[PDB]
Amino acid sequence: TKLLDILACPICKGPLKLSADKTELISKGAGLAYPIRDGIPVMLESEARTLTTEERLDKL
Amino acid sequence: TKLLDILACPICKGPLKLSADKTELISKGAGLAYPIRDGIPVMLESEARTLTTEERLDKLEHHH
């Protein structure tokens, strides 16, 4: 069991992925990216970054 | 690399370990366990459980 498997999106309760630059926790389920600051995942809609269009699309 | 490699205790900045029952992020460096509530790791001292005497001791592998 790994941490990323039990954390969930504060807004949609959906799965989170570690961003490629590893500074955020991505919630596609909500079109949001929670920032990781001072070593804490900042789970607040107020602090989250809105995913860009390209980020919301499916690479597939 | 894994998430636990990037996260640090907000108090002492030391490593964090997922607890046995997976409901807490323990910070031995701070003697606290941060609860994970409904998928959110609430990492504030005011919300943490202070580690017991047994948890704070060094893990003894072999007999003595």
Swiss-Prot record, chain B:
* Protein name, per record: UPF0434 protein PFL_1779
* Gene3D superfamilies for this protein: 2.20.25.10
Matching InterPro entries = Trm112-like
GO annotation, cellular component aspect: cytosol
User: By its UniProt entry, which HAMAP family does this protein fall under?
Assistant: UPF0434 (MF_01187)
Q: What is the lineage of its organism?
A: Bacteria, Pseudomonadati, Pseudomonadota, Gammaproteobacteria, Pseudomonadales
Q: Which organism is it from?
A: Pseudomonas fluorescens (strain ATCC BAA-477 / NRRL B-23932 / Pf-5)
Cystine connections: none
Family designation: Belongs to the UPF0434 family.
Q: Per UniProt, what is one Pfam family of this protein? A: Trm112p
